């Protein structure tokens, strides 16, 4: 078959929604497991599968045996593997604040892990690999997130009501600069004992006297992370509620967090992470600070502005690792073509894909893999298809 309908894995992480994949897509969940992520890709922990001949095979194995034909020459020579993972994320609980280092620093972190030979999966297993981890999130339902530092004057206004929480806050307020923001960020994560309990007590009190956002987001997070220094983060970081159809790119060296809702996510392949709060786990504050860019990002610059050409809505991505587009479907076919492998996912409506004599229908939530050698395919029906591919 030219077009390969995908059999995808669902990670039942404890923070997933018990209902979102079922309500959206009709995916069965009789046992009422938390269904956190639906994976579309070739990840070695749980590759998607394809059907041949009759059997099913791992997409990862099938790509390994036929890299040029499947990935396209450009991807096969640049990356040697499918260079992204594509997911539906269903966050029923807020997730950790994370930073991903850039490519060069990821290569260093990786070597350090290896040299001062940390196991693989241990405490500071923060650099599992030498790859960066750029990502784009695309909201399927209203999606609450934190992303990037606020304008410094915005941080000032938000911290005034909690000036007594911590001397690092007063220190920043006296001179609101990137240096003192860095110090504040590290002091907050490093708070212990009575210092931390004083600070959390002042924040918690401010929630009674301060209404609206980001105070309301703090309240929402505090249900899951009552004792976490990351409760201050919404005062430093932009809180964004994406409407369905909006997207945001997660830059290197930039703190962010997924807090609530359902989204598509596409990312480069890396299992690396530097956590920056909302976690009981491993935080290396010096390493974190060394890989954070303490520069504000204005609210108007957070969303990716897409570009519409005929039926295609492209979301320009500033890395080569992946590209992402939405495609409107109609009765008249449209040709969807690319130089690379592509994964097509039915967002809503119903997609009929055609390649010569083959026709493959996708209902919402279903996806197909299109080998590079099988491009273009023609798409018709109703609704929208999302595509992940490579523009190399």
Contact 84, 387 (CB under 8 A): no
Q: Which of 49, 150, 180, 275 is catalytic?
A: 275
Which of 301, 335, 352 is at the close of a domain?
A: 301
Q: Domains in the chain: how many in total?
A: 3
At a CB cut-off of 8 Å and minimum separation 6, what does 312 contact? 325, 326, 327, 334
Is residue 224 exposed (0-12), middle (13-18) or buried (19+ Cβ within 10 Å)?
A: middle
For residue 76, the enclosing domain spans 7-150+239-276
Residues 211 and 267 in one domain: no
Say if residue 257 is in the same domain as residue 168.
no
Q: How many CA atoms lie within 13 A of 325 on its CB side?
A: 20
User: What is the radius of gyration, based on Cα positions, of the chain?
Assistant: 22
Examine the residue annotation and report whether 125 is marked as an active-site residue of this protein: no
Structure determination technique employed: X-ray
Residues 6+ apart with CB under 8 A from 64: none
Instruction: Tokens 């350090």: give the residue.
Output: 112
d(CA 374, CA 188): 52
Q: Which among 392, 336, 390, 371 has a CA at the least distance from the CA of 67?
A: 371
Residues 97 and 175 in one domain: no
Q: How many CB atoms lie within 10 A of CB 7?
A: 15
The verdict on 315 and 378 lying in the same domain is yes
Which element (helix H / strand E) includes 247? strand 247-250
Q: Tally Cβ neighbours within 10 Å of residue 79.
A: 20
| Spatial contact of 334 and 378, defined as CB atoms under 8 Å apart | yes
Burial pattern 13-47, b for ≥16 Cβ within 10 A else e, equals bebbbeebbbebeebebeeeebbbbbbbbbbeebb
Residue 157's CB is within 10 A of a number of other CB atoms, namely: 11
The answer on 202 and 251 residing in a single domain is no
- Does residue 295 share a domain with residue 155? yes
- In this structure, what token pair is assigned to residue 308? 């519409």
**Could you say which of 228, 261, 276 is where a domain stops?**
276
- Kindly state whether residues 119 and 168 are assigned to the same domain: no
Task: Give me the resolution in angstroms, 1 decimal.
Answer: 1.9
Are 30 and 113 in a shared domain? yes
Same domain for 222 and 74: no
């Amino acid at each position: 078959a030219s077009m390969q309908k995908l059999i995808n894995s669902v990670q039942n992480y404890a923070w997933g929604s018990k209902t979102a994949l079922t309500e959206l897509y009709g995916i069965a969940n009789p046992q009422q497991q938390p269904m956190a992520e639906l994976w579309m890709g070739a990840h070695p922990k749980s590759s998607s599968r394809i059907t041949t001949n009759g059997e099913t095979v791992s997409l990862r194995d099938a790509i390994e045996k036929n890299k040029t034909a499947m990935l396209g020459e450009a991807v096969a020579n640049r990356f040697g593997e499918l260079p992204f993972l594509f997911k539906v994320l269903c966050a029923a609980q807020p997730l950790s604040i994370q930073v991903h280092p850039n490519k060069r620093n990821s290569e260093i972190g990786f070597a350090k892990e290896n040299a001062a030979g940390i196991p693989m999966d241990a405490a500071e297993r923060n650099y599992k690999d030498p790859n960066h981890k750029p990502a784009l999130v695309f909201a399927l339902t209203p999606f609450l997130a934190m992303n990037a530092f606020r304008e410094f004057s915005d941080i000032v206004s938000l911290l005034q009501p909690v000036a007594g929480a911590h001397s690092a806050i007063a220190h920043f307020l006296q001179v609101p600069n990137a240096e003192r923001l860095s110090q504040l960020f590290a002091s907050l994560l490093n708070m212990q004992g009575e210092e931390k309990s004083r600070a959390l007590a002042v924040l918690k009190a401010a929630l009674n006297s301060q209404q609206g956002e980001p105070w309301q987001t703090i309240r929402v997070i505090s249900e899951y992370y009552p004792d976490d220094s990351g409760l201050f983060s919404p005062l430093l970081l932009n809180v964004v509620k994406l409407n369905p159809g909006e997207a945001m790119f997660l830059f290197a060296e930039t703190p962010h967090a997924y807090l609530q809702g359902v989204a598509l996510e596409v990312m480069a392949n890396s299992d690396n992470v530097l956590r920056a709060g909302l976690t009981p786990k491993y935080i290396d504050i010096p390493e974190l600070v060394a890989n954070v860019k303490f520069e504000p990002k204005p609210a108007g610059e957070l969303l990716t502005a897409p570009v519409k050409s005929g039926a295609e809505l492209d979301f320009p991505i500033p890395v080569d690792d992946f590209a992402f587009s939405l495609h409107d479907l109609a009765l008249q076919e449209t040709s969807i073509g690319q130089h690379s492998a592509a994964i097509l996912f039915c967002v809503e409506g119903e997609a009929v894909l055609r390649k010569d004599e083959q026709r493959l229908v996708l209902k919402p939530g279903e996806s197909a893999f299109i080998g590079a050698d099988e491009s273009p395919v023609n798409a018709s029906g109703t609704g929208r298809l999302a595509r992940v591919y490579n523009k190399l």
